[PDB]
Amino acid sequence: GRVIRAQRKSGGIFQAHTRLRKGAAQLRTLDFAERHGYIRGVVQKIIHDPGRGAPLAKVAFRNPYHYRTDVETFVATEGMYTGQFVYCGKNAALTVGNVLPVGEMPEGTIISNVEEKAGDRGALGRSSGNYVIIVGHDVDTGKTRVKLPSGAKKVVPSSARGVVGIVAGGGRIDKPLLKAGRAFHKYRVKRNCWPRTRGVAMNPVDHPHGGGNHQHVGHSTTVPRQSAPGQKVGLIAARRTGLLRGAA
Amino acid sequence: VKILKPGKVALITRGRFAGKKVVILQAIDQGSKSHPFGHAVVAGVERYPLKVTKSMGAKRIARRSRVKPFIKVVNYNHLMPTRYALELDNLKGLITADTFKEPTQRSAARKTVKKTFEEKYQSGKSAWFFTPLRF
């Protein structure tokens, strides 16, 4: 046969388009100021990052050890306005836009840009309109249980940081794209993954679904988890399939 | 009862000497044929004296601890009043509104204010007036 598109997406043509992007949205390096007290920065820019549905915040901080101003690229939370003050550290106030250790926050609080590990600089709840809920704490071998946007429960060390509030950008998926052009423009600044051609519309050399006098898969689209590349197409390791009406 | 009276220390917010600390010589609310509005005659410091340490020589300390003043008529809207005030031991009535028409009169008044300001800075009872405003 022939190498399928999924196998061909290893890079090259299918790399991300990052020319117009303004920088990675990592929170900050976990330093002495954030570990023992707080540090006050002033947000000065709120900009649109192409390929990202949430605005980015350019925030200026004073370097504790050198005569220099450091600019960060915070993921802007909703309600953030230019010229305001954000506080990052253990002793920071529980205010929207402030960065605090997860273990120092009350249970049930709404946060964003949460770290999976200490010093990770933000891993969870970074997309627009998404957030993480602090479910509970456990002091003995300090660990905090949190609820992820997917609904999963994750245990993180009680020293990881998070931004109080919800990521800005609202509910972006509530508006229909309404046009192939809108979809083209959306994915142009992201990567070369659009448009997509169906496997059943292909030939047997191209896709496992290709061929036949009628456009049909022929075999089950649910493939085993340990499938070789080139045959791992369709519904990989599907626990269930079809329309579901009511479950947890 | 007046926020702006002679001897009060104010901050200049507009003009060449923006951010400079001045002392009001007379707060003339009314006006004569010329300047018939609420202006204030002030004396400020254009170049603040530089810091001096115990490790400097007497000549260098004398050179560094020098104040060059400016006398200017500034309207009320371009002033930021304070409450530190000034003694105004000598600059009471020697300088008048007529001291702005002659360049020689302006130079003489500036020299007198310079002498008073340097004498006040030496054994400074008002350090806030002579320290620069950092903005």
Binding site: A33, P64, Y67, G89 | V52, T53, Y121, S123, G124
Partner: peptide
């Protein structure tokens, strides 16, 4: 004499730039 005024530095967190102290323990040798 009156012009020699003490100007101390707090050196607290987020107050003033830290002084150049010994960093030999954290040096990447």
């Amino acid at each position: 004499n009156p012009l020699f005024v003490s100007r101390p530095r707090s050196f607290g967190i987020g107050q003033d730039i830290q002084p150049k102290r010994d960093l030999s323990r954290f040096v990447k040798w």
